[PDB]
Design a protein around this ligand. Structure first.
Ligand SMILES: OC[C@H]1O[C@@H](O)[C@H](O)[C@@H](O)[C@H]1O
Ligand SMILES: OC[C@H]1O[C@@H](O)[C@H](O)[C@@H](O)[C@H]1O
Ligand SMILES: [Mg+2]
Ligand SMILES: [Mg+2]
Ligand SMILES: [Mg+2]
Ligand SMILES: [Mg+2]
Ligand SMILES: [Mg+2]
Ligand code: NA
Ligand code: NA
Ligand code: NA
Ligand code: NA
Ligand code: NA
Lengths: 1011, 204
């Protein structure tokens, strides 16, 4: 029996699913959520042996430990211990597509544990074992006797061991198969791992026990009154003396309580459920739960005899909230939500797919700190503690069935097949049975990228029947099928339609109004944050705020799935697809995170924070209008800090309390401000600061900001005449200009500034020359590969047009000495195989003060692909500690990703001017810069720049950040213009037209001077 | 206009004039215009214009130069968008080609007079013996902008001596979503703060 090659067999002897149990035998412990002596953890050191196929495991292992086994920690994924390689594949399955069969070489993990059981557990009641996560399928033996089997890598499998155990020492044997028929439903875009990767526990329940319970909360029209209804089911000895008492607590106060014997209402001609009871508790003015204020009550479910003996108690946290879609809007407690969401896979760079409390808390803190209020469990039910944490800290959750068959062709081949209805049904029904009482879960999802099959329609209806309290969504088959209550596309653009046949991705604004459509639209995935991305993010937020039925979306995704590898010297480095010998693989497609694998933010995180702010600001005169986007709370932990500065020089600042009701406005009249007469632009910057620490943030946390230009005094003052005049010396090969301690050398053959001296020290390692290209970003490459070029990708268009290899041809190079300066004029043409792609005309004016004014005018052929940038570059000889600029910052910012940046005076260590994206590319740009200072140099103009120890050539040629090497000196790229980075998706061109350099003619000017 | 600078330099084959001016109002500088005029041995005069517009002043209607030419010629010939009047937010119907019309066709007789007759996207303009090359928008007519703004009805306009030529590096859109509230879309307002344009005036 190859049960792992039969979708008709998804378990053997497995117990029914139910919500979290702990079988407390004391009600106060259940009320306080203290640990239960009846729920033990079997996590720790286990014994493990790897085999290449199930046929290789020896019979002896059922009864005795294998000498050659190792001791390892469980939970774990065995690839993380090095027994075999993790595989990174996106769409294409990791095994041959031949359902329901899997490879005969099927890595098999033999786990075993010798553990204790106290006789007391065996004198009465039932002892079960619980495996919260085993990937992908497994057989279980206890004391050498076969117990059962399970599939579905992401939900708990439980077995009754009552009849198999003995007092004292017992031994478990778990044979885990890497591949099974369940793998056809587990093709999510992530590392393919295996093992006992979630907790293992032993739970003692009494013979007469609570076998399931469901909590519902219904409200009156204004939410001032609610009824809590709790349906409780029992298994075991049914007798009239039994009762259930459900009590509801708010802290130490008992708010309501009801007791009843078993026996539910008559439901049909054969009667009712003699083994169930429904308690209804009235609760006046309940404290409501939301992500803004996660108010919770504690429901304790006591199973007891009427005369007072507690048999056992179970319990849960309850959040009073109503989720309903009405008139096309998704409402929470009667108000329309605005989903500031993110998709989050369970990933740790050292532990793989094993989740730990610290990591989950670290993730929720950072999410909330960055203005997220919702998370989608892409693409499977999560470790159970996740839900508890979202209930308590307050995040809206989309709980998703572990069903993804992306690699099938067509994508609904299995989901439309009734033979796969049974395996799919279990992944949906068992998730609902387990997670239906958590208030954080607000929407159920039927899985991901499995097309649209009749099995989705059947399952949509199942959930709508069993749980009317939450909408059900599902994106497959075109995002607006009959199996979804919410239009939930992935990567639909704001304004641009992408009319693919069958499953078009309409502009989200257009999609809402298609003939006959009325549902709300919340993207299940948008803003693919792969590498240097998040370009256009603000476009989505402006739309969400303007259109009521556009209720947000979930960014893809939270954290890069990079894994740690160690080099010869034993230093850690971030690996991606193929780095473990895995092939085929999808390379860096596993890193799409707002944060690196160790939780350090990528620069895009601050853009998300800012666009997701909960306060909107308008300025009129010196009156600030603050509007709150909270739906339920007043701004009771917030103050507004304001500062006025003249181009970086602070002039005045203050603080004012913010007191704005949800959806309300507050007007703030600022003080008679700073009105300087000196040149420069005045600017107002406001920040919302939370004075008090919270569960998720420290005191002084900044939650929102905004900046505006106030008055501008243009400079009309004339520089003093200089007491000098540069001298020019000419040779056939060069133009040399000298002025005091300074010297400039222009090569007449190449037409560029080849060297500059200060004091008598050389300043350049490479000449100053025009640059029209960039080391391609993930979004510029998309899915292109050398074995399979994608000619539509930006990088491929640039390559084919010759941008990377065009050579400068000199058309003119002259020198003139003026009254007080020397003027160098040049013109160059860049061509490729006959074609003139760009023309650069410039003047260099060096005056008696030592300043060099550079004016550049470029022409770009209308028929060549728009270039990545229009700028100059050079390798400076100096390496300095800091970079100080007056411009946008302080973090990396690009034209379509700079809303979060503020114009000010910034000063950072050189290293901060480089963003260590795992897959190297153009990075660290800062835009809107008016003055840049590095060592003895100052550059002034209105440009964008980056500066670092790595050339664009080096970044484009190196596949991993740890292989980069600082070059001599510092490479400076200063651009008049730079293309958008895009990111609406990372597999088709996504830079919006307005961010492409298509103007044909460009002008920029800089002044390079000393100090 | 207040002068900030006016210098002259001779180069190997040309003379270079450099000027800078500020436009001010009640002590605030509204616009700064920096230019170079380079006159070569070919008789061509290359004009480069770099303008600054204070961020807190309302976005200006246009950024260009103007003059009243002494002569009057019968035709206007240009390589640009046409043949009819077109403005930035209303130029989709125009085509880029070589157009030649009588001067009067370059004036649109709106009953209530205003700025009119612009053609955008022009790379070359010919009038009389003169030729202007660059990438600009222009209007040319017997009526000054001053007259147009002071005159309420077209029948009261009178041809001035010569020809008024307005040549714009940039021009604001005209709007029209309605005619009782500001309707020029953001993308058609001159809000960039710094603007550059260049032209060559030469003799044909
Ligand atoms: O990085 C590509 C992303 O593509 C989406 O289509 C998918 O649902 C995600 O799981 C992820 O694969
Ligand atoms: O003083 C610097 C400032 O100059 C203003 O003209 C500009 O609008 C601002 O963005 C900033 O560059
Ligand atoms: Mg099976
Ligand atoms: Mg009691
Ligand atoms: Mg006993
Ligand atoms: Mg997929
Ligand atoms: Mg590959
Ligand atoms: Na909305
Ligand atoms: Na991915
Ligand atoms: Na407050
Ligand atoms: Na690279
Ligand atoms: Na008028």
């Amino acid at each position: 029996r190859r049960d792992w090659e039969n979708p008709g067999v998804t378990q053997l002897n497995r117990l029914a699913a139910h919500p979290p149990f702990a079988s407390w035998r004391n009600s106060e412990e259940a009320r306080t959520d203290r640990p239960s002596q009846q729920l033990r953890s079997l996590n720790g050191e286990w014994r493990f042996a790897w085999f290449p196929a199930p046929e290789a495991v020896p019979e002896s292992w059922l009864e005795c430990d294998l000498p050659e086994a190792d001791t390892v920690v469980v939970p774990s994924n065995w690839q993380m211990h090095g027994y075999d390689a993790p595989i990174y594949t996106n769409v294409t399955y990791p095994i041959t597509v031949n359902p329901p069969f899997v490879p005969t070489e099927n890595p098999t993990g033999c786990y075993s544990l010798t553990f204790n059981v106290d006789e007391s557990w065996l004198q009465e009641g039932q002892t079960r074992i619980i495996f919260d996560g085993v990937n992908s399928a497994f057989h279980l033996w206890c004391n050498g006797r076969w117990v059962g089997y399970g599939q579905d890598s992401r939900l708990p499998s439980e077995f009754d061991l009552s009849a198999f155990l003995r007092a004292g020492e017992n031994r478990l044997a778990v044979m885990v198969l890497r591949w099974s028929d369940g793998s056809y439903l587990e093709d999510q875009d992530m590392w393919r791992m295996s093992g006992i990767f979630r907790d293992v526990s032993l739970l003692h329940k009494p013979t007469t026990q609570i076998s399931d319970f469901h909590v519902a909360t219904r409200f009156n029209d204004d939410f001032s009154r609610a009824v809590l209804e709790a349906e409780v089911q029992m298994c075991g000895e049914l007798r009239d003396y039994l009762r259930v008492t459900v009590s509801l607590w708010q802290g130490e106060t008992q708010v309501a309580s009801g007791t009843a014997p078993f026996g539910g209402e008559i439901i049909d001609e054969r009667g009712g459920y003699a083994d169930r009871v429904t308690l209804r508790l009235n609760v006046e003015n309940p404290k409501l739960w939301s992500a803004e204020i996660p108010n919770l009550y504690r429901a304790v479910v006591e199973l007891h005899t009427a005369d007072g003996t507690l048999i056992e108690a179970e319990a849960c946290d309850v959040g009073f909230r109503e989720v309903r879609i009405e008139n096309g809007l998704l409402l929470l407690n009667g108000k329309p939500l605005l989903i500031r969401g993110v998709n989050r896979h369970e990933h740790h760079p050292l532990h793989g797919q094993v989740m730990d409390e610290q990591t989950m808390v670290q993730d929720i803190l950072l999410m909330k700190q960055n203005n997220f209020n919702a998370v989608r469990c892409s693409h499977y039910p999560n470790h159970p503690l996740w839900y508890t944490l979202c209930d308590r800290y307050g995040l809206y959750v989309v709980d998703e069935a572990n069903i993804e068959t992306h690699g099938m062709v067509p994508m609904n081949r299995l989901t439309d097949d009734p033979r796969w209805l049974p395996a799919m049904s279990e992944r949906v029904t068992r998730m609902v049975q387990r997670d239906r009482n958590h208030p954080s879960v607000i929407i159920w999802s039927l899985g991901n990228e499995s097309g649209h099959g009749a099995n989705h329609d059947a399952l949509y209806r199942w959930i709508k029947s069993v749980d009317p309290s939450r909408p059900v969504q599902y994106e497959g088959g075109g995002a607006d099928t009959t199996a979804t209550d919410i239009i939930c596309p992935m990567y639909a653009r704001v304004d641009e339609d992408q009319p693919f046949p069958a499953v078009p991705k309409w502009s989200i604004k257009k999609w809402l109004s298609l003939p006959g459509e009325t549902r709300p639209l919340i993207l299940c995935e948008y803003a693919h944050a792969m590498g240097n991305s998040l370009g256009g993010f603000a476009k989505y937020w402006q739309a969400f705020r303007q259109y009521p039925r556009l209720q947000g979306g979930f960014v893809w995704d939270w954290v890069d799935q990079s894994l740690i590898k160690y080099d010869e010297n034993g230093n850690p480095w971030s690996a991606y697809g193929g780095d473990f010998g895995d092939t085929p693989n999808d390379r860096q497609f596993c890193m799409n995170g707002l944060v690196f694998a160790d939780r350090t933010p990528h620069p895009a995180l601050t853009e998300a924070k800012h666009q997701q702010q909960f306060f909107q600001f308008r300025l009129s005169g010196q009156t600030i209008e603050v509007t709150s986007e909270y739906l339920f709370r007043h701004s009771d932990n917030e103050l507004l800090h304001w500062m006025v500065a003249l181009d970086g020089k602070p002039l005045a600042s203050g603080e004012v309390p913010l007191d704005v009701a949800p959806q309300g406005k507050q007007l703030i009249e600022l003080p008679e401000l700073p009105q300087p007469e000196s040149a420069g632009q005045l600017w107002l910057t406001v920040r919302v600061v939370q004075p008090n620490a919270t569960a998720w943030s420290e005191a002084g946390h900044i939650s929102a900001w905004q900046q505006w230009r106030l008055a501008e005094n243009l400079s009309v003052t004339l520089p003093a005449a200089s007491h000098a005049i540069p001298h020019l010396t000419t040779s056939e090969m060069d133009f040399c200009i000298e002025l005091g301690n300074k010297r400039w050398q222009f090569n007449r053959q190449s037409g560029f500034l080849s060297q500059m001296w200060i004091g008598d020290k050389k300043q350049l390692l490479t000449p100053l020359r025009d640059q029209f290209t960039r080391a391609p970003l993930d979004n510029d490459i998309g899915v292109s590969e050398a074995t399979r070029i994608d000619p539509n990708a930006w990088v491929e268009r640039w390559k084919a047009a010759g941008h990377y290899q065009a050579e400068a041809a000199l058309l003119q190079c002259t020198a003139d000495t003026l009254a007080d300066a020397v003027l160098i004029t040049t013109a160059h043409a860049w061509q490729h195989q006959g074609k003139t792609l760009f023309i650069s005309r410039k003047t260099y004016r060096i005056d008696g003060s030592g300043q060099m004014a550079i004016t550049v005018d470029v022409e770009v052929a209308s028929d060549t692909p728009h270039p990545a940038r229009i700028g100059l570059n050079c390798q400076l000889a100096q390496v300095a500690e800091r970079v100080n600029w007056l411009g946008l910052g302080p973090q990396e910012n690009y034209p379509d990703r700079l809303t979060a940046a503020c114009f000010d005076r910034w000063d950072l260590p050189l290293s901060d001017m480089y963003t260590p994206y795992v897959f190297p590319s153009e990075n660290g740009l800062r835009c809107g810069t008016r003055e840049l200072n590095y060592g003895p140099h100052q550059w002034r103009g209105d440009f964008q720049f980056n500066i670092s120890r790595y050339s664009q050539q080096q970044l484009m040629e190196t596949s991993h950040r740890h292989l980069l090497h600082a070059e001599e000196g510092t490479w400076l790229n200063i651009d008049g213009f730079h293309m958008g980075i895009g990111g609406d998706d990372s597999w088709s061109p996504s830079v919006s037209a307005e961010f492409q350099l298509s103007a044909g003619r460009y002008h920029y000017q800089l002044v390079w001077c000393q100090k």
